[PDB]
Amino acid sequence: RPAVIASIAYMDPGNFATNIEGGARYGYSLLWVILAANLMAMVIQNLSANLGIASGRNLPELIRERWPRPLVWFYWIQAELVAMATDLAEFLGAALAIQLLTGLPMFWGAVVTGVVTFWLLNLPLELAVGAFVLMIGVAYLVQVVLARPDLAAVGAGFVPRLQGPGSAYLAVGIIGATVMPHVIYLHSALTQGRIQTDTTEEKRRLVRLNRVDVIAAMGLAGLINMSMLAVAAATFHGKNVENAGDLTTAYQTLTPLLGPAASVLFAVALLASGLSSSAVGTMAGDVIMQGFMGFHIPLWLRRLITMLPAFIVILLGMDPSSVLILSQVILCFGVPFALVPLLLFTARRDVMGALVTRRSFTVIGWVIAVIIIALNGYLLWELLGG
Ligand SMILES: CCCCCCCC/C=C\CCCCCCCC(=O)OC[C@H](O)CO
Ligand SMILES: CCCCCCCC/C=C\CCCCCCCC(=O)OC[C@H](O)CO
């Protein structure tokens, strides 16, 4: 189902880095960020899936077929940058997990991950790979209960509070890792077909089934993300630990549960998430290219081009977790440019048919878009001026 692929993409190294760094640096105070981002992601993924089901065309294809040529050029370029950032995050996460597993430097780890992507790109194994991530998520769900978190701080973390200079930055990172624009584009394509009869009855059936699937998947994965942040908080926040929040250290979150094999299991799960999410990211990037332009560059060429930012970042000596969080921030910045056409098209009868979005949900989505735009503007204000 498309919800499985969306949940695979929602469990990427970017999500891992954001959850762990948020926990370690700010305690439970971003649980409300995670919850709100998960709700917005539910709404937006539902809107994109409904767009796909009702119109038969995905969001990039509709943009290309309905909007002026220069606007389509701009949209293709921005979506390509979004895909570059997403694949950078996921590929560098896979490389960092290879490093944690074997001991190789980041360069040769990225080389091994490139060989693995070459081996995979020949082609059902990504859901099996994702099962590792699902199991480490269950491990986190148990570790939350076992770690005995401070329920007072946990409850206080659900009240919306941006406290500190980098709090807005990390909340933007969480929102970008949860509401992924490449997945906003890809979800419409995942439900484009499989419709034997174009009737409104079957379209409504698909809409409801996909709604249930995506809500279940996003709810489970948001429970997992909140659990990861809570364990990271209870593990590194109050205690003064060096390099707290780095994914190299994050294995200590599951030490009281797994024991000596905690680091190996965390490295394996992060590699699994990196590979699966990178496959999903290359799929979404090819869908973006096709929908926006009409033609396609070779898949191996796109893979080799998307490896270039990863290898450049490795050569620059930049920190992997830091650049992952930055990539998720860039994704959050890219979110509104994808939300606007989605809302406009889902509020149109000539596009949706009898499945036009309810005006209440359209207003909710516009409120979400305004919130995200204001948060991105506030982050830009803090990062550039006073
Ligand atoms: C200061 C302004 C903030 C004021 C507060 C505004 C909050 C609105 C934002 C997020 C909640 C929206 C998500 C809650 C609804 C979730 C419904 C859902 O998940 O399903 C959607 C449905 O399937 C569609 O087709
Ligand atoms: C046992 C496996 C089932 C897992 C069930 C899902 C766990 C909760 C999920 C999300 C909330 C995470 C936010 C933290 C909420 C408070 C943490 C908590 O529940 O603590 C338990 C209690 O303190 C102990 O005595």
Side-chain angles (χ1 to χ4, degrees), residues 2-386:
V4 182
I5 310 176
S7 61
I8 287 174
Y10 177 51
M11 290 299 303
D12 67 330
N15 278 267
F16 275 84
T18 51
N19 293 341
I20 295 295
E21 181 71 17
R25 192 173 166 82
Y26 304 96
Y28 312 92
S29 55
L30 297 189
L31 288 175
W32 69 268
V33 177
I34 295 190
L35 173 58
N38 196 272
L39 297 179
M40 301 183 310
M42 286 184 176
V43 177
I44 296 169
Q45 290 300 291
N46 268 328
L47 287 185
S48 58
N50 299 338
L51 179 68
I53 292 173
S55 65
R57 270 67 187 180
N58 52 78
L59 179 58
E61 286 191 285
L62 288 177
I63 292 174
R64 175 200 58 186
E65 296 289 326
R66 306 181 72 87
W67 282 3
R69 183 179 176 93
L71 194 58
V72 174
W73 282 107
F74 160 80
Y75 259 69
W76 174 64
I77 297 182
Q78 67 90 22
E80 220 70 40
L81 297 188
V82 161
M84 288 293 171
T86 303
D87 192 83
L88 159 69
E90 301 160 328
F91 189 91
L92 228 57
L96 182 61
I98 285 289
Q99 169 177 275
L100 297 174
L101 199 62
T102 62
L104 285 170
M106 282 307 296
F107 172 78
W108 289 100
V111 173
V112 177
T113 56
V115 177
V116 169
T117 51
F118 290 157
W119 188 84
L120 165 66
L121 263 290
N122 296 15
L123 183 60
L125 186 59
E126 303 312 293
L127 173 55
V129 161
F132 291 151
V133 185
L134 179 64
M135 285 311 299
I136 198 186
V138 174
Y140 272 105
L141 290 171
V142 177
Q143 180 61 88
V144 157
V145 175
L146 296 187
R148 290 182 46 85
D150 195 8
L151 290 186
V154 168
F158 288 104
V159 180
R161 281 189 43 83
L162 290 86
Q163 35 172 79
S167 289
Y169 179 88
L170 203 38
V172 161
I174 293 180
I175 294 177
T178 299
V179 184
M180 292 154 297
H182 70 113
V183 186
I184 296 178
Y185 290 132
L186 179 63
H187 217 251
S188 54
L190 292 182
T191 54
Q192 267 187 127
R194 200 175 52 255
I195 178 67
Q196 175 56 58
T197 49
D198 198 66
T199 192
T200 304
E201 285 73 24
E202 298 301 313
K203 291 174 167 184
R204 290 177 189 271
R205 192 266 296 187
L206 264 183
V207 164
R208 297 172 71 88
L209 204 156
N210 182 99
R211 182 190 304 171
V212 175
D213 264 0
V214 302
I215 287 200
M218 293 300 299
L220 181 67
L223 290 177
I224 291 178
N225 283 263
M226 291 194 306
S227 292
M228 197 176 307
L229 186 138
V231 174
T235 302
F236 307 107
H237 182 45
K239 317 163 188 54
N240 197 271
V241 180
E242 58 275 10
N243 294 322
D246 196 340
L247 293 182
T248 65
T249 320
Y251 78 96
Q252 303 177 3
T253 54
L254 299 179
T255 294
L257 179 61
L258 308 181
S263 186
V264 176
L265 290 185
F266 181 83
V268 169
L270 183 59
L271 178 59
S273 149
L275 296 179
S276 53
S277 58
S278 184
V280 174
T282 56
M283 180 182 187
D286 205 74
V287 170
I288 283 177
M289 169 89 60
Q290 278 277 9
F292 279 114
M293 291 294 103
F295 59 90
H296 59 276
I297 62 178
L299 206 50
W300 63 268
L301 177 59
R302 166 178 284 275
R303 184 61 269 177
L304 267 63
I305 292 180
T306 54
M307 288 184 191
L308 290 178
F311 278 98
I312 283 184
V313 167
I314 294 309
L315 269 54
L316 302 184
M318 307 180 65
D319 194 296
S321 304
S322 176
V323 307
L324 301 198
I325 300 175
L326 184 57
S327 65
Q328 306 309 305
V329 169
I330 300 180
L331 290 191
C332 184
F333 273 95
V335 168
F337 297 89
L339 255 189
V340 169
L342 173 65
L343 296 171
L344 291 176
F345 292 162
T346 50
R348 284 177 147 270
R349 176 166 287 264
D350 58 354
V351 179
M352 295 303 283
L355 282 175
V356 189
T357 302
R358 191 181 325 268
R359 196 186 62 87
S360 69
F361 280 104
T362 290
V363 171
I364 291 177
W366 278 105
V367 165
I368 291 172
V370 171
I371 289 173
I372 294 174
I373 289 182
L375 264 53
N376 294 337
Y378 176 78
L379 180 55
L380 278 178
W381 175 257
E382 281 194 348
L383 293 186
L384 273 64

